[PDB]
């Protein structure tokens, strides 16, 4: 439609004689001291914000916006032509692709119309070019970006779930024959090529000469290159559906920065993949900037209601309202809401670990709860324990047709990166999968003695556990070494421990009754007057707590001895299956740390603590 | 004779090497191998003219498979003409030794395709001897006659050129110079210096053509510095095609500080040195410090500040490896022997254990082991070393190193040591967990050279006084107050070298006396009651 000719023109006068306001409305030549580090080769990518052609070019934006290789080619040719007139000496030859270019220039230069014979012009960059996304397009949801945006611009966020080693791929491929004594380049765009036989180099064939060819990596141009799956947010994928993975190719400079588990934001061109009834093809993404999120890393004044209001009364009473009751256990579970984000800058690594666990699954249908618990939290991502084999953390062999070889996979506690995890029917697991489990309790430590596989898993999220019983409640009159079935020293390293019986308490077995019958009757399933609210008032009051950060004092500690002492009649006494250790100590401060967060006040706070110890009397010795 | 297009001399200092015979003159041993000894593949050290000039330095990594020759070629050459009645029959390869240490070995970048690197890690796999045809040479039809062409170096011996015409394998194995070669498939795994844990760490698959395979052992250090390439994997044997993506591989070539230590010495002699170094070394180790006495002297409920205890060593140690059992078999440890149906190529698999010479394996939960298994290990505590009986080996794999733990008939007497965890049943002990670790929570170079520099030439002597000391204690106290009679005491000399090897004394003074005695009354005790 319009003369690539003029465009060309067009970035060459923006790029050197035209100017911006970004340094006090004054032009400070910021791409002309990039464009000089290229010169000098000491920068490798450049980068062209599209930002800055929007502040004073709308028509050039769109175009660009509109299709992207096209001008993404013209740019990067641009700046190659851009590059002869800022050459101020003789390269240093820093590398075996200056060495071939230099030699290749003067071979140039030395003989000085066919419009195959030239050098291409990927062959002679030495410099790679990428896009930022302008901020005026909003972000896409990964759903949302259908056939119909192919060839367009798109950024979407999503969470790495597979990433491969670093590998070379090859772009420009060099022949040389032992007849003609040329370099015959074959260009390659494709995943796979198809190397030369015969060459079609004019010379060979009006002689008639051998013609035989050797491929050779001396010369050839390489470029990083990665292959990568992203899944979409699971907090803004709608409730009836799974989040969908979409592949994304990034190669250069660019490599090397996504982390498996990582948010990141994604900026590339929408392009097909031939695999050589109707023209079918699959789609990628080939990256151009990728951009990890910061929390990665380790009008009147009565809008807020932060001292006033007691978050107890209204936040917990809003969790999880089908529930038949269990307040005290829902309370509990605000603590694992909350987990260890939010820690002190001290080094307090293990405070972000909160590994509960739940014994009796048929009991009051808490398997329901678990959706509860990843719906409303933020950063926190749903998991099955039971979503697959053993095979799933480890490396097998199985049929596959799309792509995949030497497959490395993590299970679902890789899949949770530092959010919340969980775990379903963790009885069925099998006895290896078991000791997988308790690698992970010893903070990090998964050694595998498999001659193929040597990995370190990075386990930082926090593991809810639940635990069917042993084929029926369990029975006082059955001593130890019967009584429980599940391993006890597996037990002794989680730090809380739940178990419900369903016991005929007629007080209680009244309540169960009175809640089924108000079901069927109308809509509102919590008759307490709660409206279920909208996820995003509650969302935003929450993230800003988080930048407080308020720190418990070390000097209260000293009244939390006393209680260990108490414990230890009691524990020698009873003689009880249950037993329990210093650990308690371990876990009474990390349980205190989160309380304190609802007061921000940290100078004198003895009730917040006082109950954490009164939430572990009340579940061990109920009778 | 020569072509141009790469611009290289001979050694390019010929006008320099004439005054440099008259002016070096006016390291012996680098000098006299060559001319009394007469051994092949000189072993040239590293390239110290970057010291004095870059350029020549940078000239022989650009384009090393065009170098290497040069100094070969060049250094025969000159040998030939001074020395006629020398050996020429046995080429001689220049191998550079050392060479400069690649900056960021983690971060090998793709644009470094063909230069010499430096790698650093250990041998886990190695494979059987794989020959293959090199300098290949084709057959014509007139009256079979070959002329010899192909000297120069450049040509590539393709393959599918053999499936016509297979007398090759009879005819031409020797007389066309077809003999097979030597490569050996060895896979390297890089040590990252104690990362934080991030990436995973990269797998280098070591095979070059190079037939100095096995001259060097595997199973040890590697400081190989070898060339990169890169091959073009075929999509399907049937087709053609072959994809946009190379495997790496690596070529195989390759053959103040002491001003502190006297410091140490001065400071040993005051009396509080106990009280200085127990506090120091160590502090994130909770109470029950008889405990300490394996570790400290020695380097030098469950999981109750033990299995920690270990992580400590992991920790502070890198040589070793950590495991458990109750899910590894007897065969998960080691002699996991097997090979690849896929492939159709046996693996001489080791393990673990086998690999722990020269360190300390941590080992836990001994109790839950079964039978089965523990034969191993009764070997190399009894025997020191540890045998590998399957049926492509039998033989034994030197175990010299030690292993402890601990633990919670009398047929016992197997183990080295033997303690066990009493309660003093005391709360206030309790007490100080929240204020010295909850409270609480460029030196790291120094502590890492006490190990390897100073330990390395230290050998303790005992002296004729000291030794019976230990025999005329156990008899007459023995029965004052009412098992010592084996010679189970005598061999807790091996220990005593621990007190020698603190202030790197070779001499035996009042401190490290009654050291020994009371660790009598620590074991009495635990074997009491």
Redesign the interface.
């Known amino acids: 439609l319009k003369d690539y000719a003029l465009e060309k023109e067009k970035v060459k006068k923006f790029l050197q004689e035209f100017y911006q306001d970004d340094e006090l409305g004054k032009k400070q030549f910021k791409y002309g001291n990039q464009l000089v580090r290229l010169a000098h080769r000491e920068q490798v990518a450049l980068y062209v914000d599209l930002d800055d052609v929007a502040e004073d070019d709308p028509e050039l934006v769109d175009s660009i916006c509109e299709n992207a290789r096209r001008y993404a080619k013209l740019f990067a040719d641009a700046v190659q032509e851009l590059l002869p007139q800022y050459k101020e000496r003789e390269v240093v030859?820093k590398?075996?692709?200056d060495?071939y270019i230099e030699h290749r220039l003067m071979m140039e230069q030395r003989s000085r119309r066919s419009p195959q014979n030239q050098y291409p012009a990927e062959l002679m960059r030495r410099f790679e070019l990428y896009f930022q996304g302008p901020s005026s397009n909003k972000p896409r949801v990964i759903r949302e970006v259908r056939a119909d945006s192919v060839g367009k611009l798109v950024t979407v966020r999503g969470i790495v779930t597979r990433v491969s080693?670093?590998?070379?791929?090859?772009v420009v491929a060099t022949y040389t024959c032992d007849q003609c004594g040329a370099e015959t380049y074959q260009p390659?765009q494709?995943?796979?090529?198809?190397?030369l036989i015969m060459c079609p180099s004019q010379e060979c064939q009006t002689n008639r000469s051998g013609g035989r060819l050797?491929?050779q990596?001396?010369g050839?141009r390489?470029?990083?290159?990665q292959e990568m799956k992203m899944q979409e947010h699971s907090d803004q994928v709608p409730v009836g559906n799974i989040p969908r993975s979409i592949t994304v190719l990034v190669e250069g400079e660019n490599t090397?920065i996504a982390?498996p588990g990582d948010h990141v934001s994604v900026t590339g061109i929408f392009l097909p993949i031939l695999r050589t009834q109707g023209l079918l093809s699959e789609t990628y993404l080939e990256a151009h900037r990728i951009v990890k999120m910061n929390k990665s890393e380790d009008t009147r004044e009565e809008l807020r209601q932060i001292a006033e209001e007691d978050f107890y009364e209204k936040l917990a009473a809003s969790i999880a309202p089908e529930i038949y009751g269990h307040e005290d256990v829902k309370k509990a579970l605000l603590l694992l809401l909350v987990g260890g984000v939010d820690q002190s800058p001290?080094?307090?690594k293990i405070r972000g670990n909160i590994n509960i666990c739940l014994m009796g699954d048929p009991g009051v249908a808490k398997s329901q709860l678990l959706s509860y618990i990843d719906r409303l939290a933020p950063r926190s991502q749903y998991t099955t324990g039971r979503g697959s084999s053993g095979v799933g953390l480890t490396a097998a062999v199985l049929r596959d047709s799309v792509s995949g070889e030497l497959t490395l996979e993590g299970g679902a506690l890789v899949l949770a990166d530092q959010g919340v995890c969980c775990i379903d029917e963790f009885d069925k697991m099998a006895?290896?999968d078991r000791?997988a489990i308790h690698e992970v309790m010893?903070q990090?430590?998964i050694?595998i003695?498999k001659?193929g596989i040597?990995?370190?898993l990075?386990a930082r999220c926090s593991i809810l556990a639940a635990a069917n019983p042993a084929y029926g409640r369990y029975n006082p009159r059955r001593s130890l070494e019967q009584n429980i079935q599940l391993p006890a020293?597996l037990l002794?390293?989680f730090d809380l421990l739940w178990l419900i019986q369903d016991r005929p308490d007629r007080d209680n077995d009244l309540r169960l009754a009175q809640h089924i019958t108000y079901v069927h009757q109308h809509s509102r399933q919590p008759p307490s007057q709660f409206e279920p609210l909208d996820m995003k008032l509650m969302r935003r009051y929450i993230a800003m707590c988080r930048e407080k950060q308020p720190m418990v004092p070390?000097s209260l500690?000293?009244y939390?001895?006393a209680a260990?002492?108490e414990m230890?009649r009691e524990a020698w006494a009873s003689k009880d299956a249950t037993y329990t250790?210093?650990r308690t100590?371990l876990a009474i401060?990390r349980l205190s740390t989160a309380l304190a967060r609802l007061r921000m006040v940290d100078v004198v706070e003895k009730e917040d603590v006082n109950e954490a110890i009164r939430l572990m009397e009340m579940s061990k010795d109920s009778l | 004779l020569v072509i141009w297009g790469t611009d290289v001399n001979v050694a390019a200092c010929k006008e320099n090497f004439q005054r440099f015979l008259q002016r070096f003159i006016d390291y012996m041993q680098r000098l006299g191998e060559i001319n009394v000894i007469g051994e092949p593949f000189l072993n040239v050290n590293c390239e110290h003219i970057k010291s004095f000039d870059k350029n020549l330095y940078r000239q022989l990594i650009?384009?090393p498979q065009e170098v290497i020759p040069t100094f070969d070629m060049a250094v025969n050459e000159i040998f030939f003409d001074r020395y006629p009645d020398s050996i020429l029959e046995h080429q001689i390869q220049v191998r550079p030794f050392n060479a400069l240490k690649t900056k960021n070995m983690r971060?090998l970048?793709?644009?470094?395709?063909?230069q010499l690197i430096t790698i650093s890690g250990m041998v886990?796999?190695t494979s059987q001897l794989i020959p293959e045809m090199q300098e290949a040479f084709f057959q014509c039809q007139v009256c079979a006659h070959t002329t010899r062409v192909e000297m120069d170096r450049g040509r590539?011996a393709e393959p599918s050129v053999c499936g016509r015409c297979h007398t090759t394998h009879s005819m031409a194995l020797i007389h066309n110079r077809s003999l097979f070669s030597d490569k050996q498939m060895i896979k390297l795994?890089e040590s990252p210096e104690d990362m934080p844990?991030?990436?995973?760490?990269?797998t280098v698959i070591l095979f070059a053509h190079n037939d100095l395979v096995d001259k060097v052992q595997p199973g040890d250090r590697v400081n190989v510095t070898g060339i990169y390439?890169?091959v073009?994997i075929r999509?399907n044997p049937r087709v053609?095609?072959?994809?946009?993506?190379?495997?790496?591989h690596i070529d195989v070539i390759h053959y103040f500080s002491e001003k502190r230590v006297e410091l140490l010495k001065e400071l040993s002699r005051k009396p509080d040195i106990y009280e200085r170094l127990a506090s120091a070394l160590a502090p994130s180790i909770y109470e029950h410090e008889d405990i300490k006495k394996g570790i400290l002297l020695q380097l030098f409920?469950?999981?109750?500040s033990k299995?920690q205890l270990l992580?400590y060593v992991y920790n502070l140690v890198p040589r070793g490896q950590?495991?458990s059992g109750?899910?590894?078999s007897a065969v998960?440890?080691t002699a996991?022997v097997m090979k690849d149906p896929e492939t159709r190529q046996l693996?001489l698999?080791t393990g673990?254990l086998v690999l722990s010479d020269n360190g300390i394996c941590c080992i836990d939960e001994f109790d839950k082991m079964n039978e089965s298994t523990r034969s191993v290990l009764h070997e190399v505590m009894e025997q020191q070393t540890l045998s590998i009986a399957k049926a492509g080996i039998i033989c034994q794999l030197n175990a010299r190193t030690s292993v402890l733990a601990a633990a919670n008939h009398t047929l016992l007497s197997r183990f080295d040591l033997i303690f066990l965890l009493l309660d003093p049943?005391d709360?206030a002990y309790?007490?100080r967990?929240?204020?010295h670790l909850?409270?609480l929570?460029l030196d790291m170079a120094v502590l890492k050279d006490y190990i390897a520099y100073a330990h390395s030439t230290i050998m303790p002597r005992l002296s004729e006084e000291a030794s019976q000391a230990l025999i005329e204690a156990y008899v007459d106290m023995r029965k004052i107050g009412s098992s010592a009679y084996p010679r189970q005491l005598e061999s807790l000399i091996r220990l005593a070298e621990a007190h020698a090897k603190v202030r790197l004394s070779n001499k035996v003074e009042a401190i490290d006396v009654e050291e020994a005695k009371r660790l009598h009354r620590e074991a009495l005790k635990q074997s009491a009651t």
């Open positions: 030859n590398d075996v692709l060495v080693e670093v590998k070379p791929k090859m390659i494709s995943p796979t090529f198809m190397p050797y491929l990596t001396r050839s390489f470029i990083k290159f090397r982390q001290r080094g307090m006895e290896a000791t010893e990090q430590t050694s003695a001659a040597l990995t370190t990075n020293a002794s390293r070390e500690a000293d939390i001895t260990y002492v230890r250790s210093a100590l401060l | 650009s384009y971060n970048n793709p644009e470094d395709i063909d886990i796999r590539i795994q844990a991030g990436q995973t760490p990269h390439r890169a073009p999509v053609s095609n072959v994809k946009s993506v190379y495997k790496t409920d469950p999981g109750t299995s992580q950590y495991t109750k899910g590894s998960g440890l996991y693996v698999q673990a049943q709360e309790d007490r967990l929240a204020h909850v409270a929570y």
